[PDB]
Amino acid sequence: APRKYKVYKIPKRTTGFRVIAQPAKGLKDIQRAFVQLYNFPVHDASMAYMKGKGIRDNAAAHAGNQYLLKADLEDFFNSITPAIFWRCIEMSDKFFIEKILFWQPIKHRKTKLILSVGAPSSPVISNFCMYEFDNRIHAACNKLEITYTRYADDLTFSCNIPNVLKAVPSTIEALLKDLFGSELRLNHSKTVFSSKAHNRHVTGVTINNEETLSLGRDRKRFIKHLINQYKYGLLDNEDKAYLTGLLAFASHIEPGFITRMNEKYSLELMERL
DNA sequence: GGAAGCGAAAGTGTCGCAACCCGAGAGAGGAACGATCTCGGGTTGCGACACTTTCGCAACCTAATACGTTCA
Å separating the CA of residue A224 from the C1' of nucleotide B32:
123
Answer yes or no: are the C-beta atoms of A113 and A81 closer than 8 Å: yes
Report the Cα A36 to chain-centroid distance in Å.
Answer: 22
Distance between CA atoms of residues A77 and A121, nearest Å: 12
Buried b (16+ CB within 10 A) or exposed e, A215-234: bbeebbeebbebbeebeeee
Answer yes or no: are the C-beta atoms of A61 and A131 closer than 8 Å: no
Q: Which nucleotide is nearest to A151 (CA to C1')?
A: B72
| Nearest Cα to Cα of residue A105 among A19, A16, A216, A31 | A19
Resolution (A): 2.5
Please name the residues in contact with A76: beta carbons below 8 A apart, sequence gap of 6 or more: A126, A152, A153, A184
Residue nearest to nucleotide B62 (CA to C1'): A6
Reported residue count of chain A is: 273
DSSP string, A96-110: HHHHHH-B--SSS-T
Distance between CA atoms of residues A60 and A213, nearest Å: 6
Answer yes or no: are the C-beta atoms of A3 and A26 closer than 8 Å: no
Alpha-helical regions (H) of chain A: 25-37, 55-60, 76-79, 82-91, 95-101, 122-129, 132-143, 167-179, 216-232, 237-253, 255-264, 268-272
Residue nearest to nucleotide B65 (CA to C1'): A22
Answer yes or no: are the C-beta atoms of A150 and A135 closer than 8 Å: no
Å separating the CA of residue A164 from the C1' of nucleotide B1:
42
Distance between CA atoms of residues A263 and A270, nearest Å: 11
Q: Which nucleotide is nearest to A6 (CA to C1')?
A: B63
| Strand ordering across the sheet containing A213-214 | A201-202, A205-207, A213-214
Å separating the CA of residue A107 from the C1' of nucleotide B62:
14
> Beta carbon of A22 within 7 Å of strand B?
yes
| Strand ordering across the sheet containing A185-194 | A147-150, A155-159, A67-74, A185-194
Beta bridge partners of A186: A73
Q: Which nucleotide is nearest to A222 (CA to C1')?
A: B69
| Nearest Cα to Cα of residue A62 among A212, A199, A192, A183 | A212
A49-57 contact pairs (CB < 8 A, 24+): A49/A123, A49/A124, A49/A126, A49/A127, A49/A152, A50/A127, A54/A252, A55/A151, A55/A203, A55/A204, A55/A205, A55/A253, A56/A205, A56/A213, A56/A252, A56/A253
Phi, psi angles (nearest 5°) of residue A229: -70, -45
Answer yes or no: are the C-beta atoms of A99 and A82 closer than 8 Å: no
Q: Is A75 annotated as a binding residue?
A: no
Strand B neighbours among A 197-226, CB < 7 A: 203-204
Å separating the CA of residue A112 from the C1' of nucleotide B8:
31
> Beta carbon of A12 within 7 Å of strand B?
no
Strand B neighbours among A 137-196, CB < 7 A: 151-154
Q: Is A72 annotated as a binding residue?
A: yes
* Structure-determination approach: cryo-EM
Please name the residues in contact with A157: beta carbons below 8 A apart, sequence gap of 6 or more: A68, A69, A70, A141, A146, A147, A148, A165, A168
DSSP A43: -
Distance between CA atoms of residues A78 and A65, nearest Å: 33
Protein contacts on strand B: list nucleotides below 7 Å from a Cβ.
Answer: 1-2, 61, 63-65, 67-72
* Strand pairing class (A155-159; A147-150): antiparallel
Beta bridge partners of A192: A70
